[PDB]
Write a protein that binds this ligand. Structure first.
Ligand SMILES: Cc1cc2nc3c(=O)[nH]c(=O)nc-3n(C[C@H](O)[C@H](O)[C@H](O)COP(=O)(O)O)c2cc1C
Length: 362
Protein backbone atom coordinates (compact mmCIF):
# COMPACT_ATOMS: atom_id res chain seq x y z
CA UNK A 1 0.00 0.00 0.00
CA UNK A 2 3.06 2.23 -0.23
CA UNK A 3 2.27 3.03 -3.88
CA UNK A 4 -1.03 4.62 -2.80
CA UNK A 5 0.31 6.91 -0.06
CA UNK A 6 0.75 10.66 -0.62
CA UNK A 7 4.06 12.20 -1.65
CA UNK A 8 5.22 15.81 -1.51
CA UNK A 9 6.57 16.75 -4.95
CA UNK A 10 7.85 20.31 -4.84
CA UNK A 11 5.15 22.81 -3.90
CA UNK A 12 2.31 20.25 -4.20
CA UNK A 13 1.43 16.89 -2.66
CA UNK A 14 0.67 14.01 -5.01
CA UNK A 15 -2.18 11.84 -3.74
CA UNK A 16 -0.28 8.64 -4.60
CA UNK A 17 2.93 7.30 -6.16
CA UNK A 18 1.39 6.16 -9.47
CA UNK A 19 2.33 8.96 -11.86
CA UNK A 20 1.41 9.35 -15.53
CA UNK A 21 4.49 9.63 -17.74
CA UNK A 22 4.62 12.26 -20.50
CA UNK A 23 2.88 10.86 -23.58
CA UNK A 24 3.07 12.56 -26.97
CA UNK A 25 -0.25 11.90 -28.73
CA UNK A 26 0.00 14.41 -31.63
CA UNK A 27 -3.63 15.59 -31.51
CA UNK A 28 -3.09 19.36 -31.35
CA UNK A 29 -4.67 21.79 -33.80
CA UNK A 30 -2.49 22.86 -36.71
CA UNK A 31 -1.58 25.56 -37.42
CA UNK A 32 -0.95 27.02 -33.95
CA UNK A 33 -0.14 23.82 -32.03
CA UNK A 34 -3.14 24.60 -29.84
CA UNK A 35 -4.36 22.17 -27.15
CA UNK A 36 -7.95 21.05 -27.61
CA UNK A 37 -11.01 20.38 -25.43
CA UNK A 38 -10.50 16.75 -26.47
CA UNK A 39 -7.08 16.83 -24.82
CA UNK A 40 -8.78 18.45 -21.82
CA UNK A 41 -11.16 15.49 -21.50
CA UNK A 42 -8.25 13.08 -22.02
CA UNK A 43 -6.29 14.51 -19.09
CA UNK A 44 -9.43 14.95 -16.97
CA UNK A 45 -10.17 11.22 -17.25
CA UNK A 46 -6.76 10.46 -15.69
CA UNK A 47 -6.84 12.98 -12.83
CA UNK A 48 -6.64 10.10 -10.33
CA UNK A 49 -2.91 9.89 -11.07
CA UNK A 50 -0.79 11.27 -8.26
CA UNK A 51 0.91 13.53 -10.80
CA UNK A 52 0.07 13.98 -14.48
CA UNK A 53 3.08 14.88 -16.62
CA UNK A 54 1.71 16.38 -19.82
CA UNK A 55 2.80 15.42 -23.31
CA UNK A 56 5.99 17.13 -24.46
CA UNK A 57 5.24 20.77 -25.22
CA UNK A 58 7.10 23.30 -27.37
CA UNK A 59 8.75 26.23 -25.60
CA UNK A 60 8.90 28.08 -28.94
CA UNK A 61 8.16 27.74 -32.64
CA UNK A 62 11.80 26.76 -33.21
CA UNK A 63 11.36 23.94 -30.66
CA UNK A 64 8.83 22.11 -32.86
CA UNK A 65 9.93 18.72 -34.16
CA UNK A 66 6.64 16.82 -34.17
CA UNK A 67 3.58 17.75 -36.20
CA UNK A 68 0.55 17.88 -33.93
CA UNK A 69 2.51 18.39 -30.72
CA UNK A 70 1.38 21.31 -28.56
CA UNK A 71 3.20 24.48 -27.61
CA UNK A 72 2.95 26.88 -24.69
CA UNK A 73 4.51 30.02 -26.17
CA UNK A 74 1.50 31.74 -27.78
CA UNK A 75 -1.46 33.31 -25.94
CA UNK A 76 -3.95 30.88 -27.50
CA UNK A 77 -1.86 27.93 -26.32
CA UNK A 78 -1.69 29.40 -22.81
CA UNK A 79 -5.46 29.93 -22.79
CA UNK A 80 -6.07 26.35 -23.95
CA UNK A 81 -3.72 24.81 -21.38
CA UNK A 82 -5.44 26.85 -18.66
CA UNK A 83 -8.71 25.07 -19.41
CA UNK A 84 -6.93 21.70 -19.26
CA UNK A 85 -5.23 22.39 -15.92
CA UNK A 86 -8.40 23.78 -14.32
CA UNK A 87 -10.25 20.58 -15.22
CA UNK A 88 -7.62 18.31 -13.66
CA UNK A 89 -7.52 20.41 -10.48
CA UNK A 90 -11.32 20.29 -10.18
CA UNK A 91 -11.03 16.49 -9.85
CA UNK A 92 -8.29 16.90 -7.20
CA UNK A 93 -5.56 16.07 -9.70
CA UNK A 94 -2.12 17.62 -10.10
CA UNK A 95 -0.42 18.34 -13.39
CA UNK A 96 3.01 19.30 -14.70
CA UNK A 97 3.93 20.35 -18.24
CA UNK A 98 6.95 18.82 -19.95
CA UNK A 99 8.84 21.56 -21.81
CA UNK A 100 11.08 20.44 -24.66
CA UNK A 101 13.16 21.68 -27.54
CA UNK A 102 13.37 18.86 -30.07
CA UNK A 103 16.70 20.06 -31.46
CA UNK A 104 17.94 17.90 -34.32
CA UNK A 105 15.00 15.49 -33.99
CA UNK A 106 12.88 17.67 -36.26
CA UNK A 107 11.99 18.39 -39.88
CA UNK A 108 12.67 21.60 -41.77
CA UNK A 109 9.03 21.76 -42.93
CA UNK A 110 7.96 22.34 -39.30
CA UNK A 111 10.54 25.06 -38.56
CA UNK A 112 10.00 28.82 -38.88
CA UNK A 113 10.64 29.79 -42.48
CA UNK A 114 11.12 26.12 -43.36
CA UNK A 115 14.74 26.35 -42.23
CA UNK A 116 17.05 23.72 -40.79
CA UNK A 117 16.50 22.77 -37.13
CA UNK A 118 19.11 23.68 -34.55
CA UNK A 119 21.40 21.47 -32.48
CA UNK A 120 24.67 21.75 -30.53
CA UNK A 121 26.48 20.38 -33.60
CA UNK A 122 25.67 19.88 -37.28
CA UNK A 123 25.21 16.12 -36.94
CA UNK A 124 22.22 14.19 -38.27
CA UNK A 125 20.06 12.55 -35.61
CA UNK A 126 19.96 9.36 -37.70
CA UNK A 127 16.30 8.77 -36.85
CA UNK A 128 12.79 9.88 -37.81
CA UNK A 129 10.14 12.30 -36.59
CA UNK A 130 6.37 12.45 -37.11
CA UNK A 131 4.76 14.71 -39.72
CA UNK A 132 1.15 14.86 -40.92
CA UNK A 133 0.17 13.57 -44.36
CA UNK A 134 -2.49 14.99 -46.69
CA UNK A 135 -5.19 13.20 -44.67
CA UNK A 136 -3.93 14.80 -41.45
CA UNK A 137 -2.63 11.53 -39.98
CA UNK A 138 0.79 10.99 -38.44
CA UNK A 139 3.56 9.75 -40.73
CA UNK A 140 7.21 9.00 -39.98
CA UNK A 141 9.85 10.97 -41.91
CA UNK A 142 13.62 11.13 -41.53
CA UNK A 143 14.84 14.17 -39.61
CA UNK A 144 16.51 17.07 -41.39
CA UNK A 145 20.20 17.93 -41.18
CA UNK A 146 20.44 20.38 -38.25
CA UNK A 147 22.31 23.66 -37.96
CA UNK A 148 24.90 24.19 -35.24
CA UNK A 149 23.73 26.73 -32.68
CA UNK A 150 25.88 29.85 -32.57
CA UNK A 151 27.23 30.85 -29.17
CA UNK A 152 25.20 34.06 -29.52
CA UNK A 153 21.96 32.05 -29.76
CA UNK A 154 22.32 30.09 -26.50
CA UNK A 155 20.98 32.84 -24.18
CA UNK A 156 17.94 32.86 -26.47
CA UNK A 157 17.40 29.16 -25.81
CA UNK A 158 17.58 29.71 -22.04
CA UNK A 159 15.16 32.64 -22.32
CA UNK A 160 12.76 30.46 -24.32
CA UNK A 161 12.74 27.91 -21.49
CA UNK A 162 12.36 30.67 -18.89
CA UNK A 163 9.42 32.26 -20.71
CA UNK A 164 7.77 28.86 -21.16
CA UNK A 165 8.15 28.30 -17.41
CA UNK A 166 6.43 31.63 -16.79
CA UNK A 167 3.79 30.60 -19.33
CA UNK A 168 3.35 27.31 -17.45
CA UNK A 169 2.64 29.21 -14.23
CA UNK A 170 0.08 31.41 -16.01
CA UNK A 171 -1.59 28.34 -17.55
CA UNK A 172 -2.11 26.94 -14.05
CA UNK A 173 0.37 24.06 -14.07
CA UNK A 174 1.60 22.88 -10.69
CA UNK A 175 5.10 21.92 -11.85
CA UNK A 176 7.47 22.05 -14.82
CA UNK A 177 9.44 19.10 -16.21
CA UNK A 178 12.47 20.06 -18.29
CA UNK A 179 12.81 17.46 -21.04
CA UNK A 180 16.53 16.64 -20.87
CA UNK A 181 16.21 13.11 -22.25
CA UNK A 182 15.43 10.97 -25.31
CA UNK A 183 17.87 12.66 -27.68
CA UNK A 184 16.28 16.12 -27.66
CA UNK A 185 18.12 19.44 -27.42
CA UNK A 186 19.10 19.38 -23.74
CA UNK A 187 20.19 15.75 -24.07
CA UNK A 188 22.02 16.53 -27.32
CA UNK A 189 24.22 18.96 -25.39
CA UNK A 190 24.76 16.42 -22.60
CA UNK A 191 25.88 13.55 -24.83
CA UNK A 192 29.47 13.48 -26.16
CA UNK A 193 28.22 11.66 -29.28
CA UNK A 194 25.94 14.54 -30.31
CA UNK A 195 27.93 17.45 -28.81
CA UNK A 196 31.19 18.17 -30.66
CA UNK A 197 31.39 21.83 -29.65
CA UNK A 198 34.73 23.39 -28.74
CA UNK A 199 33.43 26.43 -26.83
CA UNK A 200 32.28 26.38 -23.19
CA UNK A 201 29.24 24.23 -24.16
CA UNK A 202 31.19 21.18 -25.35
CA UNK A 203 34.01 18.89 -24.33
CA UNK A 204 34.16 18.46 -20.56
CA UNK A 205 31.12 17.21 -18.68
CA UNK A 206 30.65 20.56 -16.93
CA UNK A 207 30.61 22.20 -20.36
CA UNK A 208 28.16 19.62 -21.73
CA UNK A 209 25.90 20.11 -18.69
CA UNK A 210 26.21 23.91 -18.80
CA UNK A 211 23.11 24.57 -20.92
CA UNK A 212 20.71 22.38 -18.94
CA UNK A 213 21.98 23.80 -15.65
CA UNK A 214 21.55 27.34 -17.01
CA UNK A 215 17.94 26.39 -17.79
CA UNK A 216 17.43 24.96 -14.29
CA UNK A 217 18.90 28.11 -12.73
CA UNK A 218 16.70 30.29 -14.94
CA UNK A 219 13.68 28.25 -13.89
CA UNK A 220 14.59 28.61 -10.21
CA UNK A 221 14.88 32.39 -10.53
CA UNK A 222 11.69 32.57 -12.60
CA UNK A 223 9.43 30.44 -10.38
CA UNK A 224 11.39 28.49 -7.76
CA UNK A 225 13.26 25.23 -7.26
CA UNK A 226 10.15 23.58 -5.80
CA UNK A 227 8.44 24.03 -9.19
CA UNK A 228 11.17 22.68 -11.49
CA UNK A 229 11.33 19.00 -12.33
CA UNK A 230 13.64 17.45 -14.90
CA UNK A 231 13.56 14.21 -16.88
CA UNK A 232 16.84 12.50 -17.78
CA UNK A 233 17.81 9.37 -19.70
CA UNK A 234 21.52 9.32 -18.85
CA UNK A 235 22.19 5.57 -19.22
CA UNK A 236 21.73 3.79 -22.54
CA UNK A 237 20.65 4.76 -26.05
CA UNK A 238 17.41 6.56 -26.93
CA UNK A 239 16.37 7.49 -30.49
CA UNK A 240 19.84 6.63 -31.86
CA UNK A 241 21.51 8.94 -29.29
CA UNK A 242 23.70 7.26 -26.67
CA UNK A 243 25.20 8.86 -23.55
CA UNK A 244 28.86 8.44 -24.46
CA UNK A 245 31.52 6.05 -23.14
CA UNK A 246 31.53 7.63 -19.65
CA UNK A 247 27.77 7.60 -19.12
CA UNK A 248 27.71 6.49 -15.48
CA UNK A 249 30.26 9.04 -14.25
CA UNK A 250 28.69 11.76 -16.41
CA UNK A 251 25.22 10.93 -15.08
CA UNK A 252 26.34 11.17 -11.45
CA UNK A 253 27.91 14.58 -12.09
CA UNK A 254 24.72 16.05 -13.57
CA UNK A 255 22.53 14.46 -10.89
CA UNK A 256 24.79 15.86 -8.15
CA UNK A 257 24.50 19.33 -9.71
CA UNK A 258 20.71 19.03 -9.80
CA UNK A 259 20.71 17.73 -6.23
CA UNK A 260 22.60 20.74 -4.87
CA UNK A 261 19.89 23.04 -6.25
CA UNK A 262 17.14 21.11 -4.43
CA UNK A 263 14.80 21.00 -7.43
CA UNK A 264 11.31 19.49 -7.28
CA UNK A 265 12.08 15.98 -8.54
CA UNK A 266 14.33 13.85 -10.74
CA UNK A 267 12.49 11.76 -13.36
CA UNK A 268 14.72 8.99 -14.73
CA UNK A 269 13.85 7.25 -18.00
CA UNK A 270 15.51 3.86 -17.58
CA UNK A 271 16.97 1.71 -20.39
CA UNK A 272 14.61 -1.23 -19.76
CA UNK A 273 11.80 -0.16 -22.09
CA UNK A 274 14.37 1.08 -24.63
CA UNK A 275 15.97 -2.38 -24.81
CA UNK A 276 18.84 -2.22 -22.34
CA UNK A 277 20.15 -3.75 -19.16
CA UNK A 278 18.40 -2.24 -16.10
CA UNK A 279 20.02 -0.16 -13.40
CA UNK A 280 21.89 -1.95 -10.66
CA UNK A 281 21.05 -1.34 -7.02
CA UNK A 282 24.59 0.04 -6.67
CA UNK A 283 23.91 2.71 -9.30
CA UNK A 284 20.54 3.65 -7.78
CA UNK A 285 22.26 4.10 -4.41
CA UNK A 286 24.82 6.40 -6.05
CA UNK A 287 21.94 8.43 -7.50
CA UNK A 288 20.15 8.59 -4.14
CA UNK A 289 23.32 9.79 -2.40
CA UNK A 290 23.63 12.70 -4.87
CA UNK A 291 19.94 13.61 -5.34
CA UNK A 292 17.91 14.02 -2.17
CA UNK A 293 14.52 15.09 -3.51
CA UNK A 294 11.92 12.70 -4.93
CA UNK A 295 13.11 10.30 -7.63
CA UNK A 296 10.63 9.08 -10.24
CA UNK A 297 11.40 5.88 -12.14
CA UNK A 298 9.84 5.07 -15.50
CA UNK A 299 10.27 2.57 -18.31
CA UNK A 300 9.01 -1.03 -18.46
CA UNK A 301 7.82 -0.83 -14.85
CA UNK A 302 5.47 -3.11 -12.94
CA UNK A 303 3.77 -2.72 -9.57
CA UNK A 304 6.21 -5.23 -8.08
CA UNK A 305 9.29 -3.43 -9.42
CA UNK A 306 7.84 -0.14 -8.16
CA UNK A 307 7.02 -1.48 -4.69
CA UNK A 308 10.45 -3.09 -4.26
CA UNK A 309 12.40 0.02 -5.27
CA UNK A 310 10.21 2.33 -3.18
CA UNK A 311 10.55 -0.05 -0.24
CA UNK A 312 14.34 0.11 -0.62
CA UNK A 313 14.09 3.91 -0.79
CA UNK A 314 15.79 3.98 -4.19
CA UNK A 315 12.83 5.73 -5.85
CA UNK A 316 9.85 7.63 -4.48
CA UNK A 317 7.29 7.22 -7.28
CA UNK A 318 6.73 5.42 -10.58
CA UNK A 319 5.55 6.85 -13.90
CA UNK A 320 3.56 4.56 -16.19
CA UNK A 321 3.15 5.39 -19.85
CA UNK A 322 1.28 2.92 -22.04
CA UNK A 323 -0.79 1.63 -19.11
CA UNK A 324 -2.24 5.12 -18.58
CA UNK A 325 -3.04 5.45 -22.30
CA UNK A 326 -5.46 2.52 -22.14
CA UNK A 327 -6.64 2.80 -18.51
CA UNK A 328 -8.14 6.14 -17.40
CA UNK A 329 -8.59 4.69 -13.90
CA UNK A 330 -5.21 2.95 -13.65
CA UNK A 331 -4.85 3.75 -9.94
CA UNK A 332 -8.16 2.08 -9.11
CA UNK A 333 -7.34 -0.92 -11.32
CA UNK A 334 -3.92 -1.44 -9.73
CA UNK A 335 -5.32 -1.04 -6.21
CA UNK A 336 -8.17 -3.51 -6.83
CA UNK A 337 -5.80 -5.92 -8.65
CA UNK A 338 -8.07 -5.60 -11.69
CA UNK A 339 -7.09 -6.42 -15.25
CA UNK A 340 -6.07 -3.61 -17.59
CA UNK A 341 -7.67 -2.68 -20.89
CA UNK A 342 -5.77 -3.82 -23.99
CA UNK A 343 -3.81 -1.12 -25.78
CA UNK A 344 -4.74 0.02 -29.29
CA UNK A 345 -1.34 1.15 -30.55
CA UNK A 346 -2.71 2.11 -33.98
CA UNK A 347 -4.42 5.11 -32.33
CA UNK A 348 -1.53 6.29 -30.14
CA UNK A 349 -0.64 9.13 -32.52
CA UNK A 350 -2.96 11.47 -34.38
CA UNK A 351 -6.64 10.95 -35.02
CA UNK A 352 -9.43 11.94 -32.66
CA UNK A 353 -11.33 10.55 -29.69
CA UNK A 354 -10.84 6.93 -30.79
CA UNK A 355 -7.98 5.35 -28.86
CA UNK A 356 -7.72 8.53 -26.80
CA UNK A 357 -10.84 9.27 -24.73
CA UNK A 358 -12.81 6.08 -25.47
CA UNK A 359 -11.03 3.67 -23.11
CA UNK A 360 -13.51 2.51 -20.44
CA UNK A 361 -13.09 2.62 -16.69
CA UNK A 362 -13.90 -0.27 -14.37
C1 LIG B 1 2.71 7.22 -27.27
C2 LIG B 1 3.96 7.43 -26.37
C3 LIG B 1 4.30 8.78 -26.30
C4 LIG B 1 5.40 9.17 -25.53
N1 LIG B 1 5.74 10.61 -25.46
C5 LIG B 1 6.81 11.06 -24.60
C6 LIG B 1 7.07 12.54 -24.42
O1 LIG B 1 6.42 13.32 -24.97
N2 LIG B 1 8.15 12.97 -23.57
C7 LIG B 1 8.98 11.97 -22.87
O2 LIG B 1 9.86 12.32 -22.17
N3 LIG B 1 8.71 10.53 -23.04
C8 LIG B 1 7.63 10.09 -23.91
N4 LIG B 1 7.35 8.67 -24.04
C9 LIG B 1 8.13 7.73 -23.25
C10 LIG B 1 7.29 7.57 -21.94
O3 LIG B 1 7.06 8.79 -21.32
C11 LIG B 1 7.97 6.68 -20.91
O4 LIG B 1 9.36 6.81 -20.95
C12 LIG B 1 7.62 5.22 -21.23
O5 LIG B 1 6.47 5.14 -22.01
C13 LIG B 1 7.40 4.56 -19.88
O6 LIG B 1 7.45 3.18 -20.08
P1 LIG B 1 6.02 2.38 -20.05
O7 LIG B 1 5.17 2.77 -21.20
O8 LIG B 1 6.34 0.92 -20.15
O9 LIG B 1 5.32 2.66 -18.77
C14 LIG B 1 6.16 8.22 -24.83
C15 LIG B 1 5.81 6.87 -24.91
C16 LIG B 1 4.72 6.48 -25.68
C17 LIG B 1 4.40 4.98 -25.72
Amino acid sequence: EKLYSPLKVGAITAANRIFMAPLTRLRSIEPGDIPTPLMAEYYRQRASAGLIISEATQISAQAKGYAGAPGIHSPEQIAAWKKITAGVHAENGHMAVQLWHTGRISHASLQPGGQAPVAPSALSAGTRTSLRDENGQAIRVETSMPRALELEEIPGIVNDFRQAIANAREAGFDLVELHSAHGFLLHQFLSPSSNHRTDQYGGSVENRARLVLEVVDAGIEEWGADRIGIRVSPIGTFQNTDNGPNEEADALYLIEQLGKRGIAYLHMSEPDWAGGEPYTDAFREKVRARFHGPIIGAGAYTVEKAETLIGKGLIDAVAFGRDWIANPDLVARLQRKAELNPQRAESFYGGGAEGYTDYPTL
